């Protein structure tokens, strides 16, 4: 449109409209050139390939891509607070995206004739890497300028080698748009209908749903013997009632479980051995053992045991300024997922006991522990909580069948997620980088809390006690930090 | 009815991630400072391209009910009549019924084509589905069996059968 | 309504306790209702 006229304005804010929210975030970005405009085949033995568990095969591309998949992109800490204290549920509706006010720099002067190529994959033909919880998200604090992450993908492998079924994709084989300093790029997306995320905690447990004042008309076996001696066998039956709530009949049972190892934040209590990988729960696929992380949604711990956390069973976030390798416990934030204990078994405990034999006068009744339990009819469970820092959506693997597609790191499982957005630098070459702006807009649907609860709720609140710094704000050096992981589950419901 | 799927995935469940970008999630990398007594410590590291085993994933492979592994090299096979005794079966009203073909599972690991499941094949091999489906002759995975403490070391069991869990995908059997 | 552009979260009124003999603002074992504390109206903030 013009060299000396801007192609777009800056939109950051949220509108709370009735039953809906509209979030809009605009960021400043910079895209370099990757691999000297080349594709370069990557395998593990390139870096030395220690384990077959780590053995991979794939490529790297010159293209970049945008990832807005984390909640702190679209929600300020206050917007997050308004949403979680006031609402039982939410879910996305429409998506909106703009790429504008582009600039290209020859390495440093202005190149006004250079272009930037961008395309979205709306038939989902490329490997979709947006559901892998990678770094490179639009920064939470809108004044941060960020670097576009380099795109890459993996395909089939045997060891470091490829196979006959392995694939290779050329992103140049997709028609794309070319943008100069007056051009802009935009598109609109429509989320496919998903169930509302539950931003609430049950006020009742699955086993306490009974009337405490009344007996059941059901009976249970109270006594198998009259007393101590020989040949004391008898069958007694009692009424299940208030005084014994453990034996009563129930219509629904807690959800599935896959047991985790229990680790204490008090280091002396832990065993003095390298049990971090050896004791971990894993699943093996094609001879390769992959760790189970975070796994099925289960409560982190039992009442009175908050010092413990499941080894691979929780989402762990880094604090601002934390390093990449071998950081201390204080430097990370281990999320707590106890709201779900009402319907979900404790991650570090066995699902229960089963009878392992037939009793007789010659054999005692023997039971054994259920370490893992698949879906049974009558089970009810909560999905994993979503956080300000955590993932929004994921793509459901395209397969003959799936069960409860909701992803295991939290968020909204989608067969047609938001499409990936690829970008590059159009290229012996001139050293070159481009910058510009990005604005994203999402419409959210909200489920209002209609509770008749008499006493006041638990709310998320900023502490008033004096401190050196304001939480969710910059320090003296100008660094923005998020002091804690904020889940969405505060308000309560009846089970 | 749904379209029968007639394709082989070019990607595996464990290989979904972007090989060039580090995950923003931490895992527990080390539980001891060094060798010897009183070395307990807690160290965490970013999951990344170098270690692809420990990453977090949104989806896990489908259910499995293990089969006995029989080799096309007769000498390798055990010297006993284990065709019936070593078979995976289900019991219904007092009657044992063999599991045939059974849940759709990869017939063998990649790198061994001489093995096949005892009752698990129609000898047509399913190895194309080894991407999202575990191996009929292998364990589904390992499960922690206790609480480790200063006295007791961490322990793990084997999962021979695994029922449906939320977040599983699988391929059906081929026609 | 409040339209504040404040970035960080507000202070809210919430029930602080974890485990306790009586939930606040509810009957006791004798059936006696009670209001545990006096609650003010001022939590959200404005610019002066």
């Amino acid at each position: 449109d013009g060299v000396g006229s801007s192609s777009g304005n800056w939109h950051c804010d949220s509108q709370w409209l009735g039953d809906r929210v509209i979030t809009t975030s605009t960021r400043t970005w910079a895209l370099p050139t990757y691999n000297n405009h080349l594709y370069k085949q990557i395998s593990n033995s390139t870096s030395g390939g220690s384990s077959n568990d780590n053995a991979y095969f794939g490529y790297s591309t010159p293209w970049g891509y945008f990832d807005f998949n984390r909640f702190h992109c679209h929600f300020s800490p206050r917007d997050w607070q308004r949403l979680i204290n006031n609402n039982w549920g939410f879910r996305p509706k429409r998506l909106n995206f703009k790429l504008f006010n582009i600039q290209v720099k020859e390495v440093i002067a202005n190149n006004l004739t250079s272009t930037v190529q961008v395309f979205t994959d709306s038939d989902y033909q490329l490997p979709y890497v947006l559901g892998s919880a990678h770094e490179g998200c639009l920064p939470p604090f809108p004044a941060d300028v960020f670097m576009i992450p380099q795109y890459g993908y993996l395909t089939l492998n045997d060891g470091s080698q490829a196979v006959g079924r392995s694939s290779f994709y050329c992103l140049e084989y997709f028609p794309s748009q070319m943008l100069r300093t007056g051009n802009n790029f935009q598109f609109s997306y429509e989320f496919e209908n998903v169930p509302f995320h539950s931003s609430y905690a049950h006020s009742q447990s699955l086993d306490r749903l009974m009337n405490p004042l009344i007996d059941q008309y059901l009976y249970y076996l109270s006594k198998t013997i009259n007393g101590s001696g020989q040949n004391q066998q008898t069958l007694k039956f009692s009424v299940a009632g208030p005084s014994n709530m453990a034996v009563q009949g129930r219509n629904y049972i807690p959800g599935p479980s896959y047991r985790q190892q229990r680790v204490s934040t008090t280091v002396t209590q832990n065993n003095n051995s390298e049990f971090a990988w050896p004791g971990a729960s894993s699943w093996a696929l094609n001879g390769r053992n992959s760790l189970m992380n975070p796994g099925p949604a289960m409560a982190s711990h039992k009442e009175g045991e908050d010092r413990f956390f499941p080894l691979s069973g929780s989402l762990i976030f880094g604090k601002q300024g934390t390093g990449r390798d071998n950081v201390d416990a204080d430097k990370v934030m281990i999320t707590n997922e106890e709201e779900i204990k009402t319907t979900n078994p404790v991650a570090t405990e066995s699902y229960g006991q089963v009878a392992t034999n037939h009793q007789s006068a010659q054999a005692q009744a023997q039971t054994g522990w259920v370490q893992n339990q698949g879906i049974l009819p009558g089970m009810v469970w909560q999905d994993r909580d979503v956080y300000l820092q955590g993932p929004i959506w994921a793509k459901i693997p395209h397969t003959d069948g799936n069960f409860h597609p909701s992803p295991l790191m939290g968020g909204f499982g989608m067969k047609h997620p938001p499409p990936q957005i690829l970008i590059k630098n159009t290229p012996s070459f001139i050293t070159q980088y481009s910058t510009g702006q990005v604005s994203v807009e999402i419409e959210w649907e909200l489920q209002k809390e209609n509770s008749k609860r008499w006493n006041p709720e638990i709310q998320y609140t900023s502490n008033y006690y004096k401190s050196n710094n304001v939480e969710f704000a910059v320090n003296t050096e100008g660094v923005y930090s998020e002091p804690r992981p904020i889940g969405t589950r505060y308000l309560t419901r009846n089970l | 009815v749904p379209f029968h799927s007639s394709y082989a995935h070019s990607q595996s469940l464990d290989r979904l991630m972007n090989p060039l970008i580090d995950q923003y999630l931490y895992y527990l990398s080390k539980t001891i400072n060094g060798s010897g007594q009183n070395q307990q410590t807690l160290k965490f590291s970013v999951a990344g391209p170098s270690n692809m085993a420990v990453q977090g994933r949104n989806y896990i492979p489908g259910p499995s009910y293990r089969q006995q592994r029989v080799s096309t090299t007769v000498t390798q096979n055990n010297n006993s009549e284990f065709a019936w005794p070593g078979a995976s079966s289900w019991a219904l009203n007092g009657r044992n019924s063999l599991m045939n073909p059974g849940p759709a599972m990869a017939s063998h690991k990649e790198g061994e084509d001489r093995f096949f499941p005892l009752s698990g094949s129609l000898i047509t091999n399913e190895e194309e589905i080894k991407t999202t489906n575990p191996v009929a002759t292998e364990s589904y995975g390992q499960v922690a069996t206790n609480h480790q403490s200063a006295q007791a070391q961490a322990q793990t069991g084997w999962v021979q059968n695994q029922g449906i869990l939320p977040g599983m995908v699988w391929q059906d059997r081929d026609v | 309504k409040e339209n504040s552009k404040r970035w960080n979260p507000e202070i809210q009124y919430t029930s602080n306790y974890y485990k306790s003999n009586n939930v606040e603002f509810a009957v006791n074992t004798e059936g006696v209702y009670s209001e545990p504390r006096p609650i003010g109206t001022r939590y959200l903030t404005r610019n002066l």
């Epitope: 934040t265 008090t266 280091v267 002396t268 982190s300 711990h301 009442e303 009175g304 045991e305 908050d306 010092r307 413990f308 956390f309 929780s314 201390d328 416990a329 204080d330 934030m333 281990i334 999320t335 707590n336 106890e338 502490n463 008033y464 006690y465 804690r484 992981p485 904020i486 889940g487 | 400072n33 060094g34 009183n38 070395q39 307990q40 410590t41 | 602080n16 306790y17 974890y18 485990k19």
Partner: antibody, heavy 126, light 104 residues
Framework: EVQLLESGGGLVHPGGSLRLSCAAS????????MSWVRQAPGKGLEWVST????????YYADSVRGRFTISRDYSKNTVYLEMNSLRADDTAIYYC?????????????????????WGQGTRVAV | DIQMTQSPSSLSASVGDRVTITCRAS??????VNWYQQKPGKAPKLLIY???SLQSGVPSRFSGSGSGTDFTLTISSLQPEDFATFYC?????????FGEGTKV
């Protein structure tokens, strides 16, 4: 300010029971871990017990464990240290200390760091 | 159980001149050590936390250093207010442990 009033006082006969109270004021009671530190006559000061802000984690010293019990009442912002089956060496002046580290319920972390604000203390003779 | 041993048991020194006290822990506890002082008849007061960080009210003449096993509490510009029994504490793991103490 921040103010810690502990009075369990007492002179008891060995094997007897005593309950220390510490009335805390001026800070968010739930978000800080409260601990008891003990100092015998003419000796060094010895840590006894601590309790999480949410009271989900109570830590006892090795000599103390199984006898003393720490708890907190959220209605009166008071931390209790009931001790039973007391012994001669329990004679000392007990302190009530607030922790430096502020915590919340949404992260699993150790609840003890350093004792920021102490208290004048009471005497337990036995 | 982790043991903190504070090397000078008692000490006396001239005012204004540097004094240094150290304690050696039984294991690598990283930066978890803390420092306190107790005057006769008065409750203890926190000086240093997380090995070197000083408390808001503590004078800048106090400082601390070390990691792993070894930790030192250095006092430059000793003063008459500064004469008291001093302690080092581990914050690393429970049960928590105080040093033997140093009367200065």
């Amino acid at each position: 300010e921040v103010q810690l009033l502990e009075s369990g006082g007492g002179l008891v006969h060995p094997g007897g029971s005593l309950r220390l109270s510490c009335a805390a004021s001026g800070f968010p009671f739930s978000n800080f871990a409260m601990s008891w530190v003990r100092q015998a006559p003419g000796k060094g000061l010895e840590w006894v017990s601590t309790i999480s802000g949410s009271s989900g984690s109570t830590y006892y010293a090795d000599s103390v464990r199984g006898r003393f019990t720490i708890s907190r009442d959220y209605s009166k912002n008071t931390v209790y240290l009931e001790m039973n089956s007391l012994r001669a060496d329990d004679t000392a002046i007990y302190y009530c200390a607030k922790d430096r580290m502020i915590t919340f319920g949404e992260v699993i972390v150790k609840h003890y760091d350093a004792f920021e604000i102490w208290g004048q203390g009471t005497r337990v003779a036995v | 159980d982790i043991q903190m041993t504070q090397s000078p048991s008692s000490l006396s020194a001239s005012v204004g001149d540097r004094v240094t006290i150290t304690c050696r822990a039984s294991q690598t506890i990283s930066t978890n050590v803390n420092w306190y002082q107790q005057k006769p008849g008065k409750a203890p007061k926190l000086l240093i936390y997380a090995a070197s960080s000083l408390q808001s009210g503590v004078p800048s003449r106090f400082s601390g250093s070390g990691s792993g096993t070894d930790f030192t509490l250095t006092i430059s510009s000793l003063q008459p207010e500064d004469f008291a029994t001093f302690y080092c504490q581990q914050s690393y793991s429970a049960p928590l442990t105080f040093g033997e103490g140093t009367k200065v």
